[PDB]
Design goal:
The protein has 20 helices and 30 strands. The protein has 2 domains: about 1-515, ANL, N-terminal domain (Rossmann fold, 3-Layer(aba) Sandwich), CATH 3.40.50; about 515-633, GMP Synthetase, Chain A, domain 3 (2-Layer Sandwich), CATH 3.30.300.30. Helix 14 crosses helix 15 (about 390-400). It has an 8-stranded mixed sheet, sandwiched between helices. A 7-stranded mixed sheet has the order 5-4-17-16-18-19-20, with helices on both faces. The protein is an alpha/beta fold and about 625 residues long. The structure holds coenzyme A (COA), adenosine-5'-monophosphate-propyl ester, chloride ion and magnesium ion. Adenosine-5'-monophosphate-propyl ester (PRX) binds near residues 384, 407 and 412. It is classed as ligase. The entry lists the keywords AMP-forming, Adenylate-forming, thioester-forming, ligase. The assembly is monomeric. The entry is titled "Acetyl CoA Synthetase, Salmonella enterica".
């Protein structure tokens, strides 16, 4: 069953079926001309000459786009929209408590970004310095990000759910000189400590780069204060000049870093530069959401994730759209909250995650009870696979069967949408990301690297670069080359598996490496295992994900305790909290299976294939029977 393109969308779409085909073909056959023209979606201070200059060569990966051009991301997201749309709302902020909200015009946002840019400069921050941002979903988070970009300071945003230990890990790696946070974040009626977490992270003896902590008073809760080091947001910004001229940044100047979980090791800092990234974010946002001036757009993704960077802030603001930043959760106070927000602000485009969709779907009609939803024209899905059932429920209950759903597949490392439908150009299949975006050349290869043609399945790779591609891993280009370009020579390996049907539509099935999808969040099994083994009483651990009807995968941890230790309610709680302390609550194991029978190879390597099956229910071969019986209990 394929959903046809509705007449209302066909009548106003920026790209129709024929135009998609033509543009895609040119983007592949002649990227220099295609992207040379499309790059004009942004204002450049000095024009670029060279467009595409990339190589996926083994151990010699180099990616550059519009390299000789200069620009400023903040000028593109703010300044250039002032003359004609200064009074237009740039950000609609909806608080956790619906009684709280703000409408921030482009002019107001520009003013605050200018004041905060000067605040950073006066504090000593210069182009190239890394600034850690550990903020909740409040407008100030966007102000800080845009201000860093404006002066060329590389921001390192850290999701508020990261534990103090995880926060320290990011700061140590990036040598951030400044941390911008809030006393507390507000979510689902609860206050989440943030400042206290920063205090604890800074006590780590390995953190030596941080000289100041700017704190926003969001809740006014009693927090510890270190005079001199800590500074109040309000005190600083109110003393800064609202006058700031944007300086030109090179297309390849670093813009931001996002720590992302991988198959092995702890999170690495995926680095994005400026030019190609912004061109790609603005282009994908505009065409995939079919953005028209005046449209009210709402991405539910947290600012701490790449989706928040590209589609909550940068892509939309670059295009002059009104973007909505929601402080809370889709189902608080009630499951109808998301749709109530849609009605309250007359949202025209809604972009959310399958886990959220499934959580609302579990409440049936209570998710739409008392809501209208008529303002919606476009729906979107991101972050993980979505089954036909959830897709249809979303399409019917939320979209009232009138809105195309754009299921966008991409990753932190890709900067923007990679395989996605365009509302007025591609007919939809529930659960399918469909076709590649302009400039994207996907392929499916077997474990040997052989490309598979026609209707088939295999490892998902991208055979050439695209403007928004991550350029490296902070401080470790060698690891960047090995992680993404060594498995299949001359190709970018996504780590995902996928199938392509008879029509050429892609269906992303999920990670084929040891990366999990927990509630729409990317987590490495290795990092959870390392966290567990760090505990004084744990000798070894094997972590696998198991299917979960709501969050996609639940975390199942097989744990071997040292001799002298025994399981107990206390230890069960201590171990679960230990992971929460080492990484954060998102990585807390849902199940702890105590065992001394971990399956291993004769070389001593643990075999997770067998553990994966057992947890789902599906050197010493005797461990299998033992594990099975322990699992039964
Ligand atoms: C459906 C959903 C709202 C459910 O939220 P939930 O009921 O809090 O459950 P989660 O699994 O997200 O959270 C589990 C833990 O993380 C914590 N947590 C979640 N988000 C947090 C945040 N922004 N800051 C701090 N802590 C957070 C919770 O407090 C909880 O910890 P606790 O039990 O110790 O209090 C949520 O999982 C979601 O939005 N998922 C989709 C992710 C997404 O947008 N993906 C697209 C790619 S970004
Ligand atoms: C894109 C925002 C999240 O980026 P992250 O880097 O955190 O995670 C990327 C991974 O999320 C899944 N994923 C993401 N979007 C989809 C999607 N639309 N369908 C299926 N899986 C998806 C894929 O496995 C991919 O390797
Ligand atoms: Cl303040
Ligand atoms: Mg140990």
């Amino acid at each position: 069953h394929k959903h046809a393109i509705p007449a209302n969308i066909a009548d106003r779409c920026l790209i129709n079926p024929e135009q998609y085909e033509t543009k895609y073909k040119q983007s592949i056959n002649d990227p220099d001309t295609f992207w040379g023209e499309q790059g004009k979606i942004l204002d450049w201070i000095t024009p670029y000459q060279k467009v595409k200059n990339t190589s996926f060569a083994p151990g010699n990966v180099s990616i550059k786009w519009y390299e000789d051009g200069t620009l400023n991301l903040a000028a593109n997201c703010l300044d250039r929209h002032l003359q004609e749309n200064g009074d237009r709302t740039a950000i609609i902020w909806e608080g956790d408590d619906t009684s709280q909200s703000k409408h921030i015009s482009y002019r107001e946002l520009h003013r605050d970004v200018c004041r905060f840019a000067n605040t950073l400069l006066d504090l000593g921050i210069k182009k190239g310095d890394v600034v850690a941002i550990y903020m909740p979903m409040v407008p100030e988070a966007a102000v800080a990000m845009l201000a860093c970009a404006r002066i060329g300071a590389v921001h390192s945003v850290i999701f508020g759910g990261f534990s103090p230990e995880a926060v320290a890990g990011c700061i140590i790696d990036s040598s951030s000189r400044l941390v911008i946070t809030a006393d507390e974040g507000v979510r689902a009626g609860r206050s989440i400590p943030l400042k206290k977490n920063v205090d604890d992270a800074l006590k780590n003896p390995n953190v030596t780069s941080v000289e100041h902590v700017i704190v926003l008073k969001r809740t006014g809760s009693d927090i510890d204060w270190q005079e001199g080091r800590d500074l109040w947001w309000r005190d600083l910004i109110e003393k800064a000049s609202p006058e700031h001229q944007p300086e030109a940044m090179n297309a390849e100047d670093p813009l931001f870093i996002l720590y992302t979980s991988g198959s092995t090791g702890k999170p690495k800092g995926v680095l994005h530069t400026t030019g190609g990234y912004l061109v790609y974010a603005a282009t994908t946002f505009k065409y995939v959401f079919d953005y028209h001036p005046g449209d009210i757009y709402w991405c539910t993704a947290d600012v701490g994730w790449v989706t928040g960077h590209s589609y909550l802030l940068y892509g939309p603001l670059a295009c002059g759209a009104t973007t909505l930043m929601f402080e809370g959760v889709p189902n608080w106070p009630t499951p109808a909250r998301m749709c109530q927000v849609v009605d309250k602000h007359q949202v025209n485009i809604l972009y959310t995650a399958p886990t959220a969709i499934r959580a609302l779907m579990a409440e049936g009609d209570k998710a739409i009870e008392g809501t209208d939803r008529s303002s919606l024209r476009i729906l979107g899905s991101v972050g993980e696979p979505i089954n036909p059932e959830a897709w249809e429920w979303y399409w019917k209950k939320i979209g009232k069967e009138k809105c195309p759903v754009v299921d966008t597949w991409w990753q932190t490392e890709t900067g923007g949408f990679m395989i996605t439908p365009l509302p007025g150009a591609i007919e939809l299949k529930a659960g399918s990301a469909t076709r590649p975006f302009f400039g994207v050349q996907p392929a499916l290869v077997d474990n040997e690297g052989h490309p598979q043609e026609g209707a088939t399945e295999g490892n998902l790779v991208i055979t050439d670069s695209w403007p928004g591609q991550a350029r490296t891993l902070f401080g470790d280009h060698e690891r960047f080359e090995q992680t993404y370009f060594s498995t299949f020579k001359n190709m970018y390996f996504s780590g995902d598996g996928a199938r392509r049907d008879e029509d050429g539509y892609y269906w992303i099935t999920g990670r084929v490496d040891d990366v999990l999808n927990v509630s729409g969040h990317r987590l490495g099994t290795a990092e959870i295992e390392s966290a567990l083994v760090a505990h004084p009483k744990i000798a070894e651990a094997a972590v696998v994900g198991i299917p979960h009807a709501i969050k996609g995968q639940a975390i199942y941890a097989y744990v071997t305790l040292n001799h002298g230790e025994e399981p107990s309610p206390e230890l069960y709680a201590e171990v679960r909290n230990w992971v929460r302390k080492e990484i954060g609550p998102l990585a807390t194991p849902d199940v702890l299976h105590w065992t001394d029978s971990l399956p291993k190879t004769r070389s001593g390597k643990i075999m997770r294939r067998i553990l994966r099956k057992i947890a789902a229910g599906d050197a010493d071969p005797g461990v299998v029977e033992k594990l099975l019986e322990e699992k039964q209990a």
